[PDB]
Amino acid sequence: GAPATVTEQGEDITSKKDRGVLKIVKRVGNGEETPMIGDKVYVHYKGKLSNGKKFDSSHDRNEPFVFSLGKGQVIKAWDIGVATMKKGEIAHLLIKPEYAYGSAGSLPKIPSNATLFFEIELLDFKGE
Ligand SMILES: COc1ccc(CC[C@H]2OC(=O)[C@@H]3CCCCN3C(=O)[C@@H](C3CCCCC3)c3cc(OC)c(OC)c(c3)OC[C@@H](O)[C@H](O)COc3cccc2c3)cc1OC
Numbered sequence: 001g002a003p004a005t006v007t008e009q010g011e012d013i014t015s016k017k018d019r020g021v022l023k024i025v026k027r028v029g030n031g032e033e034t035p036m037i038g039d040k041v042y043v044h045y046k047g048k049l050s051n052g053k054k055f056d057s058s059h060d061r062n063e064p065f066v067f068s069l070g071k072g073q074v075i076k077a078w079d080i081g082v083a084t085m086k087k088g089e090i091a092h093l094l095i096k097p098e099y100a101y102g103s104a105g106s107l108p109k110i111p112s113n114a115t116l117f118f119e120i121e122l123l124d125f126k127g128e
Contacts, residue, residue, distance in 0.1 A: 003050050003117045006094035013084055020096040021077045026119070029086025035125040037070035041082055042123040050094065050115035064123055075100045077116070085122040093118045 010022030035041050042064040046057045058065040067073040069083055077099035085091055095116040097103070105112040 002092055002119070003094055003115075006092050006117070010092070010094055013080060014099070018096075018098075020099040021080050022094040023081060023084065024092050025089060026092060027088065027090035027121075029089030029122060031086060034086055035069050035083060035122075036127075037083075038128045039069050039125045040066060040128065041069060041125040042066055043082065044121040044123065045118055047116060047118045049110070050117050054109055056109075068128070069125075075116075078118075078120075081118075082120065082122065085120065087122055087124055090119065090121045093120065 006022045006024055010024050012019050012021070013023050014020045043066075044058045045065055046055070046059070048055045067078075070079055075095070077093060077095040080099065081091065081093045081095075093116075095118070097113045097115065100116050101110040101112075101114060103112050105114060
């Protein structure tokens with residue numbers, strides 16, 4: 001399924017080329033612009049532990065998930081991954097623990113050393 005496809009086909013978007021954040025594009029976005037650090041971004045998403053024991057969506061609230069890039073609002077993998085996305089893009093990300101919750105984990109949802117999978121749709125972004 002989607003997580004195994006990212007492992008086999010995903011691009012390594014990390015600087016260190018350690019396969020910590022792997023990406024595939026499921027839908028090409030519009031234009032060329034991608035968001036800057038400090039930009040307010042609006043997404044829909046679905047996330048899961050790569051073994052599927054826990055799941056989370058924005059579609060629960062039926063409202064965008066809003067966060068600002070580079071402000072420490074989200075796991076490091078989201079700052080890296082969303083920064084690469086165009087408006088309208090849908091991407092899949094597979095994330096190693098070093099770019100998410102690490103050895104500490106985050107009880108009760110996230111065990112130590114957890115690989116995460118996300119689908120993210122970048123709806124819009126705006127300047128601070
Ligand atoms: C700067 O570093 C951080 C900043 C913030 C956080 C808090 C967690 C933060 O969630 C995330 O960063 C990612 C990406 C954005 C969407 C939510 N994320 C999750 O990891 C999900 C996971 C995904 C796999 C399946 C289980 C849920 C998430 C993790 C949560 O805690 C660890 C969590 O509880 C807070 C959560 C949703 O709740 C969703 C919703 O019920 C809350 O109302 C809003 O949650 C967040 C809101 C903002 C940021 C994050 C969570 C952690 C950070 O580093 C460890």
